[PDB]
Design a protein around this ligand. Sequence first.
Ligand SMILES: Cc1cn([C@H]2C[C@H](O)[C@@H](COP(=O)(O)OP(=O)(O)OP(=O)(O)O)O2)c(=O)[nH]c1=O
Ligand SMILES: [Ca+2]
Ligand code: NA
Ligand code: NA
Ligand code: NA
Ligand code: NA
Ligand code: NA
Length: 320
Amino acid sequence: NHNLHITEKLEVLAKAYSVQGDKWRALGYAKAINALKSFHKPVTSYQEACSIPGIGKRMAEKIIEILESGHLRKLDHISESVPVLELFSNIWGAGTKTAQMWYQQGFRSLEDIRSQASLTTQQAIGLKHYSDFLERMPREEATEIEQTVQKAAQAFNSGLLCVACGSYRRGKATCGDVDVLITHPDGRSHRGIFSRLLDSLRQEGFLTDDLVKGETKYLGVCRLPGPGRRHRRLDIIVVPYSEFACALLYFTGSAHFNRSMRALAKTKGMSLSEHALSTAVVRNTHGCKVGPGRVLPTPTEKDVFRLLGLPYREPAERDW
DNA sequence: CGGCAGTACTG
DNA sequence: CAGTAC
DNA sequence: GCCG
Ligand SMILES: Cc1cn([C@H]2C[C@H](O)[C@@H](COP(=O)(O)OP(=O)(O)OP(=O)(O)O)O2)c(=O)[nH]c1=O
Ligand SMILES: [Ca+2]
Ligand code: NA
Ligand code: NA
Ligand code: NA
Ligand code: NA
Ligand code: NA
């Protein structure tokens, strides 16, 4: 990217808006930052600024102020609460509303939180792993965590397929957590083995805490055995085989890629989720689904793209 | 003006 | 439900 | 914040 001196300043404002709960404004900044991250050359004109998709007059004004001043004045009037709100919302299970409430209650540090705040069960796990959950692991370690889950699941049924998704499948060198998708061509055997799997991984000491436990979705905390190991976030989802392609696509991301793809499906009277790509979806004037539509067969990720009129993108090309 | 992805846990 | 999360 |  040849616009670092601009995007670096925009990232600051976008994070401020995010921690402060202004999610749609933050969203607009994010997209503009990506667009600026993509454009081939340094932006030099307000007209060249408005020329990019995701950059309006408001954002070009800011970009222009940067090129002529080397500075964005609004960065000087970011509230003093923002660093504290960021600190608090980096606790897993605390978001903007909880951080803002803690702030209004007078809390300013994690010592304040530890000693005086009311914490949910999730937020107490998040706090005790605060530093660890802010770390990314090398992908080599994501592979060891995936193999640990896979070998535990395959002990129950050899026919279980286990695939690490998210940034791991997109080829990144580091991973924020591990996303393991499980299915079975059986169409049936995926049922039941999920709860038994978690008990097996608990019994050996691999799983150290549970955050979310659904019937096909688990979010938790694991740590490989031996010295020099940190606690790592682990997500596991178990899906029927008929949903594998859409679950793989969802679980692989990126998040912004999924949202773009789902928005595109909406323009075409379709709807894409981790369960299925559906056609003939009826919506009202507020974009809210009013009728379900029909599931389209998607045996492979390529079918989803094809049915959406798009060229296939391999995982590494799905960061946005 | 008004949507901005679609879904799933928690309590 | 609101909040938080993937 | 942007865009239809
Ligand atoms: C956070 C998030 C994730 N997802 C999907 C796509 C993500 O790849 C997948 C796993 O969630 P993450 O683990 O948060 O995604 P990631 O692995 O891509 O993160 P990073 O690039 O920083 O390493 O869940 C959504 O569809 N929407 C979201 O808001
Ligand atoms: Ca991940
Ligand atoms: Na534009
Ligand atoms: Na958080
Ligand atoms: Na006090
Ligand atoms: Na994850
Ligand atoms: Na809750």
